[PDB]
Design a protein around this ligand. Structure first.
Ligand SMILES: Nc1ncnc2c1ncn2[C@@H]1O[C@H](COP(=O)(O)O)[C@@H](OP(=O)(O)O)[C@H]1O
Length: 135
């Protein structure tokens, strides 16, 4: 469930890397305005896109969320992150949704795949496409 204009990697960046505001309520409006619904929970990793791509270079492991998937990778190091949790839902007016922010330092497991041949930049052949877990 991502808008059509984004590749999975670009959506991953929009959802878990580019926190447009350190405040969850404002940061979430971007995600919410794009997916036409106020996401209940969402984690922003306080790290760089380049850092996550390199974690994609770590050993493949089974995805905690999906036992049938082997495209996940463990960060190896803990990173600061912000977890946004929906506090005030408005299915009729998304921009009105309010969130809480919960700071933490944890590991992350990301699923990575080959880039979108047509739309993802050639600079990164392998890109994160999903944030499986924060441990
Ligand atoms: N092992 C895996 N490899 C690639 N994509 C996966 C995956 N496990 C789950 N996904 C999906 O990739 C998308 C990434 O979003 P998130 O980072 O929010 O999970 C989600 O789908 P939808 O966005 O189609 O629901 C998610 O469910």
């Amino acid at each position: 469930m991502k808008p059509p204009q984004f590749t999975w990697a670009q959506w991953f960046e929009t959802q878990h890397i580019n926190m447009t505001s350190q405040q969850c309520t404002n940061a979430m409006q971007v995600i919410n305005n794009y997916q036409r619904r106020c996401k209940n929970q969402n984690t922003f990793l306080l790290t760089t896109f380049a850092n996550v791509v390199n974690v994609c270079g770590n050993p493949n492991m089974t995805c905690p969320s999906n036992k049938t998937r082997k495209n996940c990778h463990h960060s190896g190091s803990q990173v600061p992150l912000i977890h946004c949790n929906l506090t005030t839902p408005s299915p009729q007016n998304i921009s009105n949704c309010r969130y809480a922010q919960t700071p933490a330092n944890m590991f992350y497991i990301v699923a990575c795949d080959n880039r979108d041949q047509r739309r993802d930049p050639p600079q990164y052949p392998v890109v994160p496409v999903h944030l499986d877990r924060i441990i």
